[PDB]
Specification:
antiviral defense, 25 strands, globular, endonuclease, magnesium, RNA-binding, monomer, 10% strand, RNA binding, alpha+beta, six-stranded mixed beta sheet
Length: 1062
Amino acid sequence: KKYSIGLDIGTNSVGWAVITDEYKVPSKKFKVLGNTDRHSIKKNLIGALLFDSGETAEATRLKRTARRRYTRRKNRICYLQEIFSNEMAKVDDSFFHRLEESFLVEEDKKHERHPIFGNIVDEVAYHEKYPTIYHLRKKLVDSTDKADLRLIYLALAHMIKFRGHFLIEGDLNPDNSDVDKLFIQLVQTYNQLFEENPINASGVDAKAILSARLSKSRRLENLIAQLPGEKKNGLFGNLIALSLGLTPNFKSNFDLAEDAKLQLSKDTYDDDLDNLLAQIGDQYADLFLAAKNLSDAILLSDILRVNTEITKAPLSASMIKRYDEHHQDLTLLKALVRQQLPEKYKEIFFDQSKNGYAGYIDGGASQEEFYKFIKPILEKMDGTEELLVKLNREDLLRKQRTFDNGSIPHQIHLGELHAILRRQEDFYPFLKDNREKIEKILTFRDSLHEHIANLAGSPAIKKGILQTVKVVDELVKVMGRHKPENIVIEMARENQTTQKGQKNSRERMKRIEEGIKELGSQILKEHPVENTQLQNEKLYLYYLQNGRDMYVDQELDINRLSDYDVDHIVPQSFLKDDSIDNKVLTRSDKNRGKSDNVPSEEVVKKMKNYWRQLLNAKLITQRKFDNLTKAERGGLSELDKAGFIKRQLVETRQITKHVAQILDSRMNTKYDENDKLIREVKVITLKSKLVSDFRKDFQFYKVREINNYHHAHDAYLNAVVGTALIKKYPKLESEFVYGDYKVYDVRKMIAKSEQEIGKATAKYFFYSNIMNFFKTEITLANGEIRKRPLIETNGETGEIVWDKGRDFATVRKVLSMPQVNIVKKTEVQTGSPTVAYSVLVVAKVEKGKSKKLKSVKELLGITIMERSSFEKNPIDFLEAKGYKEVKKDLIIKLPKYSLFELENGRKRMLASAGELQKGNELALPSKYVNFLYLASHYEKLKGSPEDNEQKQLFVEQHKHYLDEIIEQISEFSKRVILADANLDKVLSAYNKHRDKPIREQAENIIHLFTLTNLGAPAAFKYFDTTIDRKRYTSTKEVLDATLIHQSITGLYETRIDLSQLG
RNA sequence: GUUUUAGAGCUAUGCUGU
RNA sequence: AACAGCAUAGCAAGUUAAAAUAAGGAACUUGAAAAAGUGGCACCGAGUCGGUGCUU
């Protein structure tokens, strides 16, 4: 019908949900297979999937290769031959036959040994007049005389063999060229991916500093001599060092225990990069990928100082100049060494043993070794002017080919192709006809698996992408091959692992330190605060503010933190951002004025001076002070409004764009009479902050530890928000919906007056905050509350979008729904013996002294050295192992984590051949979940005072809710886990500590949820007592149990009963 | 970075041979 | 004499291109495999999902 699917892709889960126009989750029926009679079943459309990482055939069939690029080359040269064949059979004669047979010696040629034309004359003359290829190419470029079709063929083959990369899309231009703008892009990406400890480059002419002709060390040092805040050992210093050709290290910045050396010119680059990334984390995979575009530009600048003409390759001019210089130095050096200092001449030009000059040209000698060897002679030689500096400048006797013929955009090549074709349009009639096609093939650049492998990242995300694609295909096949109207994609942020929770504290500690030493106030001396206390927002802002209120000149008291209030410089009605850059402290928020704009001018005039000594201390940023004094330049403008719109609705991560492109290409396939792509399935991408604030605002709280439902919860919410946005603002689709859409402007979205023009024009909105229509009342910065219509409808078509009374109840029901599927992906592992996978075998064994045989079933563990021999002849294998009369048909392969269930619906998970794991999940009511979260967050409410006090009364009324949650876990434990002594200790301790404060009770109940937690048994702590794990050694009760084959998503289930077999 | 083939080497001396 | 192969003693000089790449001491069905397929529709309820109607 009308429906949608949200997704949330991470390293540990894939969520999925299905909604309708009213935002209801359908509930349907599916068939049951197996051997019992549990025919009736019915499920929801909400679930999640989990898989464990590790080396596996899946992890290998997503690897890196080259043979494929090589065969791409062979098919493209074959295509060249295909194009040339017909017109040569129509122009040349034995042209093609002689060129293929070139390896044969002069007794079986059956033709003439001169492949150029057929005479001995041209042959040597060819390279005599065209020694370096650039001669030939330049000749075609600026020559109007006739040429040989075969020489054009060879030249064209050369340019396509060395074509380049595709790291930049579109035609070349200053936007995607030059140096300074790319440096600006790098610093902007750094300053975006961090919120802390920034770097400001105010109009530094980076091109003149980086493109200057210096050594590989001095060019690094040159910019490092600026940017005071950073050091050469910093991450930025390592980045800039990497993007020139040195060998930096990656140890100290990421605190790793293994040395990491990486170099772009080195062949093994990507393998080291992805190993590093999979070690550290995938959020940082946007800082190295912005230096591979700066090093390319820098090398282009280094090679192309020249550009005498316009219709030439400046690289070609530079290269031919280099060859001429190489010849000239050949002659001079030759003369000097042979004449002036006659000895050692053989040692330099003929020895070839210690890699002299001839050894460097012909032998396996390297440039650095050659320079080291030739240093002493040049040092001790007389008349060495104009030579020594160019030695360590690396510009002596340079080969025309080095490690820099990859860094090379294909636009220069295609432009020279176009120039050559234009020069020779008419002589060959097919050149004009097929110029478009040859351009198309030489610019032209697979399958779903190959595209998934194409993204540069750790294998975890790639596995997640593959599983996402399979989940999408399954979901679209459930609904009768009907395509959706909206599919939101949203990335799952990784929660802090308590390691990065300290590093940010250290960074803000550095901030407060540098401010305190720059200014000189003894705030730290009067009050000692450590990083465990920097986590307090009000305290850290108090230290940021030196201890003085900014709207009124008076010192702030320390121990009256309850009375103070936190405000926003930008009112939340205009923009929703809560970070430190837009949070300040004051006695009361009533000093801002009576307007809704940035604060009044009457305040800034008084404490301008205070704000200068705040800003020059580097403790606040330029953008922060810009928002502080936004009122002096007129106020809010259309450019600023569009800026906030784009910051709130437009993404910056390219990997999300990549996966969105993958799904858009995979699903959207229909076309029209023209060559336009009919985009019937829209793909919408959002940030996490929207859903986070939605939950925080409308009290749909989420807890992660209780069970695995939160992934699917976020999956539902994201699609819910996305459909409302697309249905509310159709014209803003070009901002977040992917595709080549029609651009728009800033004048049509912004009105002139709030109440005098709002709701009186076709224009959408006036307040810059997009998410205001989610709410029912909009609070202003002055205390006035606005009223929104009960039913929200689109003014253009006339269709409703939002129902206040129905949608909230439906969403609350969806969150309170108790039956949500979770599934663990079963896989076979590929690659103190280790068991690859166990087997189930029925056979006859000897029990007693008379060797009397009886048929049994036992769990035998095949080792990793044994699986192939098991495959070849399991009958005699098991006969040698100790079994007799094995049933080949009844032998069933069992991998790790196979689902077994017993009476009363209890489920068990297999861990090894002699141990077991839990296999059931707890379901808890939404009200109890809410109470648990609120009790855990009594001090960390981080909300308005009225909401906070209402919540604490809510907590303190329902003191019995503790009693029936302890009850709830008790009967469930007695039902399933059967750990009697353990329940005995837990309830004894609980009755012991009944009267202790509700807070301290809360997190310890959360800890006690570990017994019901899914996975291997694990120890935990109560208030003061410890509980040790109870391994499930017995493996007999699984013999009469039942096998349930749980699917990839949980939709289809088939159950096999082990009691009937054997 | 690796392996072969084709890019007529010259002058003066001596040697074997067809 | 011409030429091939040798022992000299000196003099003039370098970057392109096809080829090669691994004997290394979830569950089910048809198919070797690439790959094809397998699980009905509405209503009222809601403790791991239940009931009713139509229809395979």
